[PDB]
DNA sequence: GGCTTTCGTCAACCCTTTGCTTATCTTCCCT
DNA sequence: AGCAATTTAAATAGGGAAGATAAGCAAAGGGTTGACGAAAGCC
RNA sequence: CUUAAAGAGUCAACCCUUUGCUUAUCUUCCCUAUUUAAAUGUUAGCAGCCGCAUAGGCUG
């Protein structure tokens, strides 16, 4: 028995575009399941799954360069030469209007679900980008799967992620197959020694490079399980859908 | 006259025992109708203080205080056809 | 003893010019 | 002061012409976006 | 606590000019629109004269 809460129509702007060195776009699951768990953290609701869709997005700039931002000179010691412009490093914006929706379980008003996440919201950033505007959430349950498949339809319309899975490997895949690639996780390199210059000191650290997993846009209401469009964190330090690789 | 009515998810998704479902019956459900005269809905006369209908109230709930002992020990299901019982003799009176 | 400023150091490309998908709809039935 | 009738049938076919051309210029710019290493005054 | 955290792309403009889409065409034959029927619904609310009446009565 499964409850879920919609936020439709997020309009989002200024999203890190850079969901890694090799993929400029549409933020990867790792980014929304983030998202989940940081409600988790400030509400309290735990956050099994998560599944996103876009109604629309924008990578600032061209259709083959993105637009660079101009950099402003923050960094410590650099005086002198903050007159000339600062450097730039790679970061690519743009705008996005999403369509959001939690799996939750709750065990108290639908009102106070939707303020607690409206709270949050309001106080949320995705992908790095101002929440410029979004609808009011809504409360759907998913009893059976006829159910599920309400809860699906009402995020209509938006372009959910469904999982394909990697054959050989990334670049091959998406010449061949055209798939689009994402971040499905990370993988770890090494243990990180020094703690001083992190958000916490207690949380064990690792480099890592991100791993990616093949991906396709389908409309919310062609999805035939639900399941293949919730992504959660899987236990390999990745994230997965419900409903494995999509067929 | 009739049954509350419950719009939300979570409480339709969850709520299953009998005080934790009807704890979630709200004046929204149906009776709330408008609501621009609550006060005046809300200020009421005691005149029903005569001599039989005390006498059939003090009756009528101690006949209750003395028989309750035995509605603990019931079931939910119990619970829920003898409430049904009660709510159809009750309409039919 | 670092420390912060400014000047000197080290380079060298082969590019390409839209789709990705493509939207949540009535038979029985008796009141 | 509303009443205005019903069915029945609506054409078979033959044609939609090719021949010509479809300019040549000249433009299409760069201006900022550099981090380590190394002298070198300075607390 | 989401490759989290952060960032002003600004400016400027003369698309010019030129032009022959002309030419000739048989649309054409054919043929039954036929047959009915109450306009009813009171189908009219008038003309004088008795009167102060545009109140009320009478006359045919």
Redesign the interface.
Known sequence: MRKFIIVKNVKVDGINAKSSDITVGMPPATTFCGLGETMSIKTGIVVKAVSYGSVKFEVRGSRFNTSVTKFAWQDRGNGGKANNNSPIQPKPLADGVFTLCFEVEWEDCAEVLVDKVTNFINTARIAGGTIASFNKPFVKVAKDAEELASVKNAMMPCYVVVDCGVEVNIFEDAVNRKLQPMVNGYKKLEKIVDNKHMRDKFTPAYLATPTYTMIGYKMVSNVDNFDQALWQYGENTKVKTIGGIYN | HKKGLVE???????KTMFTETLQ?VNVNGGWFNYGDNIDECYKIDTSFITDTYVKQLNRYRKKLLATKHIWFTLGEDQKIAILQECRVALMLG
Do not use: F
């Open positions: 939300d998810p979570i409480y339709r998704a969850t979630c």
